[PDB]
C-alpha cells in the first residue's frame, strides 16, 4: 500500500538528516543563496588558498595536497553512507560478507551523487560548506590533476538540473547501495527483493513530489549509469595518481 | 491517455516486424527445438566450420580473420536495419539532421548488442539468418585476441535473456535508446528529449501490460542500459588492438566511420 512506501520514505529521509550533516537543501542556501547568515571563504588563487588555509579548519607540492583533502573527504563520507545504510530496512539482515560488498562498490556513486548537492557550475563547497572553491581554480592545476574534478562538475551540472531535494535523494541513494549486480555478491534475491521495495518507493515519491516533472524517475534510473561510468573513468585516473606520487600508515587509512 | 501510447506501442511493434528478419520470437523456435525444419547447422570447432561452408553459405585467410570479418559483414548489415527502423520513430526524421546522424553513431551499436541476446543462449549464438549456432566455446577458442570478442557480450546475453522480454517490448526498447540527449555533440537536446519523455512512457505502460508478475521490470530494464555502454566501451578499445597488430585486414568503411 501506499502508506507504506510514503512510510519507508519519511524514515529514508529521517536516517539521510542524521546520517549526513550537510544537507542539500542546506548546502543550496550557503552556496548562490540569497541569505547572508554566512558568506563561505572562496578559493580561487593559489594566492588564497594559503590565505584560506590559516584561517580556517582543515585536518592535514600544491596540486597534491589539494588531492589529498578530496581524499579526506571519502574517508569521512564512506562512513556517512555506511550508518546510512544500515538504517535501510534490511540492509542489516542481509549476509554480512554481501553487506561489505554492496559498500565496497556503491561508495563511489553515493559520493559523486550528493557531491552534486554541494557543486554548482562555478565551483564546490569545502569543510562542511566552509569553502567554495572554484572550478575555474581545479582546472588550473597540474596536469595529472586538472581534470580530476571536471568530470564531477560536468556530471553535477546534469544531475542538478533535475531539481532532487534531499528527500528524493535519500530513496534514490538507497537504491544505489542495493545494486545487486555487485560483484561477488553471495546471497542476491533478498538485494533485489529490497531494491525493488525502494525503487517502488522512490518512483511514489518523484510522482508525488514532482507531477509536471513527466518520467523524472525513468531519467533519475539512467543517471544511475552516467554514474557507473564516472566511477569508472575516475579509477583510470587514480591508478596514473599512482604513476606521480610513489606515509604508510597513511596509505593504509586510503587504500582503495 | 493510456490508449495514444497503446497505439504508439503498436506502431513501433509493427516497424519492427518489417526492419529485421531475425526476431527474438524467431530466433527462440530454432534454439529451442520447437521444430524439425528450422533447425540449425553447429559449428563447435574448426573441423565443423569447413563443413558448414559446405552446407551453409557464408561470403568467405585464416580462421580468427574470416569469422571477425564475418561479424563486420553482419554489423554493416544490422547497422542499415536499426537505421530504417530509426527513420519509422515517430519524430525521428524530423530532427536536424546533423543529429539524426549523432544518434545513430552513438545508438546503433548499443542496439546490436540489445539484439544480439535475442540470438543467444547461455552455449552459443545463431549466425546467418538462423540457419546456424557457433558454440559459445569455439568462439573463445580463437586466436590471442579474437577470442575475446564475442565473450562479454554471452555475458550481457544470459543476465539480459533473464528478463524475458519478447519483441513487442524490444521495439519500444530499442527506440527508447535511440532517441538520447546524452549524446555527445547534439545541437538542440530538448526536441530530441521531448520524445524519448514519450517512447519511455509508452515504455513503461508496455512492460506493465504485457509483464505484470514481473515486478519493477521497466525500472530493472532502463538499469541494463549501462552495462550495454560498458559493452561499447570494451568493444571499441579492443577494436583498436586488432587494428594495430593486424595491418593487413581491413574495416568496412560504414563502421569505420560510426566509430569515434
Ligand atoms: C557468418 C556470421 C557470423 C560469424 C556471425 C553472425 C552472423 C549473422 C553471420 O552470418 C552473427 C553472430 C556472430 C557471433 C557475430 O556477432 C557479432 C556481431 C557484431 C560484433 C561487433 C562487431 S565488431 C565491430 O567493429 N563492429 C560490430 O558490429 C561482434 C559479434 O557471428
Do not use: W
Not at 562542511?128 to 581545479?138: A, K, P, Y
Not at 513530489?209 to 575516475?234: C, G, W, Y
Not at 585516473?237 to 586510503?254: A, N, R, S
Amino acid at each position: 500500500e501506499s502508506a507504506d512506501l510514503r512510510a519507508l520514505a519519511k524514515h529514508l529521509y529521517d536516517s539521510y538528516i542524521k546520517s549526513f550533516p550537510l544537507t542539500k537543501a542546506k548546502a543550496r542556501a550557503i552556496l548562490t543563496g540569497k541569505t547572508t547568515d554566512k558568506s563561505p571563504f572562496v578559493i580561487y588563487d593559489m594566492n588564497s588558498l594559503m590565505m584560506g588555509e590559516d584561517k580556517i579548519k582543515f585536518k592535514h607540492e600544491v596540486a597534491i595536497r589539494i588531492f589529498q583533502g578530496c581524499q579526506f573527504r571519502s574517508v569521512e563520507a564512506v562512513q556517512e553512507i555506511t550508518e546510512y545504510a544500515k538504517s535501510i530496512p534490511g540492509f542489516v539482515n542481509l549476509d554480512l560478507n554481501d553487506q561489505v560488498t554492496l559498500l565496497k562498490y556503491g561508495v563511489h556513486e553515493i559520493i559523486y551523487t550528493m557531491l552534486a548537492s554541494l557543486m554548482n557550475k562555478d565551483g564546490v563547497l569545502i569543510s562542511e560548506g566552509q569553502g567554495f572553491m572554484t572550478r575555474e581554480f581545479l582546472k588550473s592545476l597540474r596536469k595529472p590533476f586538472g581534470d580530476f574534478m571536471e568530470p564531477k562538475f560536468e556530471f553535477a551540472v546534469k544531475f542538478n538540473a533535475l531539481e532532487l531535494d534531499d528527500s528524493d535523494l535519500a530513496i534514490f541513494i538507497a537504491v544505489i547501495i542495493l545494486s545487486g549486480d555487485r560483484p561477488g555478491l553471495l546471497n542476491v534475491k533478498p538485494i533485489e527483493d529490497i531494491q525493488d521495495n525502494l525503487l517502488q518507493a522512490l518512483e511514489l515519491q518523484l510522482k508525488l513530489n514532482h507531477p509536471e516533472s513527466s518520467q523524472l524517475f525513468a531519467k533519475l534510473l539512467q543517471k544511475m549509469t552516467d554514474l557507473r561510468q564516472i566511477v569508472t573513468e575516475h579509477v583510470q585516473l587514480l591508478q596514473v595518481i599512482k604513476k606521480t606520487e610513489t606515509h604508510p600508515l597513511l596509505q593504509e587509512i586510503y587504500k582503495d
